[PDB]
């Protein structure tokens, strides 16, 4: 059966199943999926472009811009001009956003550890390395 | 940076990037993403339940049911009663659907081979095995 070992189907199912487990925790802590993705992606990061944020959060850019309108209104993120290009807007998490998301990030790390524990450190690191290499080869 | 090596973020980005490449081919051949997922998932398969189809295609069940309404109208799939449970509807691809999707499936295999070639057979098989094991541990 083609679909049983078709890579894009395997990636999508694993991603949906693992993510859906953590989304229940995020909601119990008052976060939407998109708010969790944005704050977790900006935590501990230097300011990044809207386009970079859209790529790492797998969210369409117009959706990200609307999300940032409301997250900035709530003081959780800040948009700022690029030091050179008028075309580029950068975005950062604020202290308020970081404090709001820190505990959830620790829960996310615990959930990830539980997901990866049956595989062992070797297989877990190999998976993460392969995924990172694939992203870096296919990102635009 | 948390997000740089957070497994759910890595899975989601790799899945989105790889899938988006193939979706361009599917559309050039007249398929929507959802039609491609359904027909490819049913190709060469015995009839499966709507719930199984929704899981493997990562599509919400009500969306799948509406999709099947129109795909069945076009003669590409068929819904049939479960041999035991009135609660369960099964679904299969028809010959018309299989003939419509066969060439696209060969293109999908070629694209997958190109995605996996830089990694080598060992790393490719390890990735697929880990993803399959994760799905089977997290599916409900
Ligand atoms: N791209 C993602 C990022 Cl950045 C984070 Cl933190 N979480 C998730 C998830 O929903 O599991 C995703 Cl897909
Ligand atoms: N779940 C999926 C299945 Cl069954 C197929 Cl054939 N293709 C894709 C894709 O869009 O790349 C997905 Cl996610």
UniProtKB/TrEMBL annotation, chains A, B:
Protein name, as recorded: Transcriptional regulator, MarR family
Lineage of producing organism: Bacteria, Pseudomonadati, Pseudomonadota, Betaproteobacteria, Burkholderiales
Transmembrane segments: none
Ranges of residues in domain HTH marR-type: 4-136
GO biological process, one term: response to stress
An MF annotation (GO) of this entry: DNA binding
Keywords on record: DNA-binding, Transcription, Transcription regulation
Source organism, top-level taxon: Bacteria
Pfam families per the UniProt record, alphabetical: MarR
Chain residues that bind (indol-3-yl)acetate: 19, 23, 37
InterPro entries on file: HTH_MarR-typ, MarR/SlyA-like, WH-like_DNA-bd_sf, WH_DNA-bd_sf
N-terminal signal peptide: none
